[PDB]
Amino acid sequence: MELRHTPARDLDKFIEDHLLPNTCFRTQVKEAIDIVCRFLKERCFQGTADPVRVSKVVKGGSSGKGTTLRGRSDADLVVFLTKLTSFEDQLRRRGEFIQEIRRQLEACQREQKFKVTFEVQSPRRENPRALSFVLSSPQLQQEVEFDVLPAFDALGQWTPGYKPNPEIYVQLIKECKSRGKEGEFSTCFTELQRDFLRNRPTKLKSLIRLVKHWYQTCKKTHGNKLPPQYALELLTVYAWEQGSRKTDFSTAQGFQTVLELVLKHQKLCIFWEAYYDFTNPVVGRCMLQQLKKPRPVILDPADPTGNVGGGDTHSWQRLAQEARVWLGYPCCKNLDGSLVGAWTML
């Protein structure tokens, strides 16, 4: 149903129905990306003086956009380029890469056959330049629009289980410190962001998708004022990693634990040592710089410089106000009419 009234007794039955993505549509999209990824690497540039080439194409974060309930989703597709001198190059040469990618993307639409409907958008308005392509399957009425975000390849060839070279983060921090603008290069580390949320248990990933939709429902109210969606995703992971650590758990317990953290934002300092740590002196100091920043501070596991949900303390206040309202909703309330309760952090 609406889910404002969806009780806490079941919860999952709502996630399994409305929230769960189409299995058939995903498979079609994943294949379409593989066609494009394999297309861009070969086609882009080539027969060209400049050694810069497309190394890989990775899908980034995605958020279901409410229309009926879930009718559509917006995702980010990061195109990695090589032979760039610095991280800043992806910002300056962005317009140069936007044209080369768009040129072959249109050519890919003509030459390559797809199962879904490949849609290359017209030049985008209300934005400085912008680009995107839409993948839709009218049979299932599923639609997704990918925003192409060109980025330098920092990791090069990287596989899960391997901690990235600390030297890479050193170059990132030194360049982010001098030129300013902390956390703009997070797109290069997208592989680590996906790998962070991919290996999570099924019940947790379903919980995250529940939190994802909660964010979108409030996003059509307060607008862009609220913090980035990535903050809520990492916060859900933190709620599970602390005190629970169970394969099977209650969604009502977790959803309650996440909402109470939104109100605790001023008390929240969170960071992950997954892809980096204090072994390197340069990385260590920069990591301590972020921890002493005004709360809430959620440190991007893939981006030691990048602070998710930071820079605005009134963003979380607007979020905490609506988080307080949803606490009064039956969503968190069980059969008794009382609260299900949060997770013990012991």
From Swiss-Prot:
Cofactor(s) the record lists: Mg(2+)
Subcellular location(s) of the protein: Cytoplasm; Mitochondrion; Nucleus; Microsome
Entry-linked SUPFAM superfamilies: Nucleotidyltransferase (SSF81301), PAP/OAS1 substrate-binding domain (SSF81631)
Top-level taxon in the UniProt lineage: Eukaryota
Binding-site list for Mg(2+): D74, D76, D147
EC number: 2.7.7.84
Annotated residues for binding of ATP: S62, R209, K212, Q229
Modulation of this protein's activity: Produced as a latent enzyme which is activated by dsRNA generated during the course of viral infection. The dsRNA activator must be at least 15 nucleotides long, and no modification of the 2'-hydroxyl group is tolerated. ssRNA or dsDNA do not act as activators.
Pfam families: NTP_transf_2 (PF01909), OAS1_C (PF10421)
Catalysed reactions listed for this entry: 3 ATP = 5'-triphosphoadenylyl-(2'->5')-adenylyl-(2'->5')-adenosine + 2 diphosphate
Keywords: Antiviral defense, ATP-binding, Cytoplasm, Endoplasmic reticulum, Immunity, Innate immunity, Magnesium, Metal-binding, Microsome, Mitochondrion, Nucleotide-binding, Nucleotidyltransferase, Nucleus, RNA-binding, Secreted, Transferase
Segments for region (Interaction with dsRNA): 12-59, 199-209
InterPro entries assigned to the protein according to its UniProt record, in alphabetical order: 2-5-oligoAdlate_synth_1_dom2/C, 2-5OAS_C_CS, 2-5OAS_N_CS, NT_2-5OAS_ClassI-CCAase, NT_sf, Polymerase_NTP_transf_dom
BP-aspect Gene Ontology terms: antiviral innate immune response; defense response to virus; interleukin-27-mediated signaling pathway; negative regulation of transformation of host cell by virus; negative regulation of viral genome replication; regulation of ribonuclease activity; type I interferon-mediated signaling pathway
UniProt subunit comment: Monomer. Homotetramer.
PANTHER family assigned: 2'-5'-OLIGOADENYLATE SYNTHASE 1, 2-5 OLIGOADENYLATE SYNTHETASE
Protein name according to UniProt: 2'-5'-oligoadenylate synthase 1
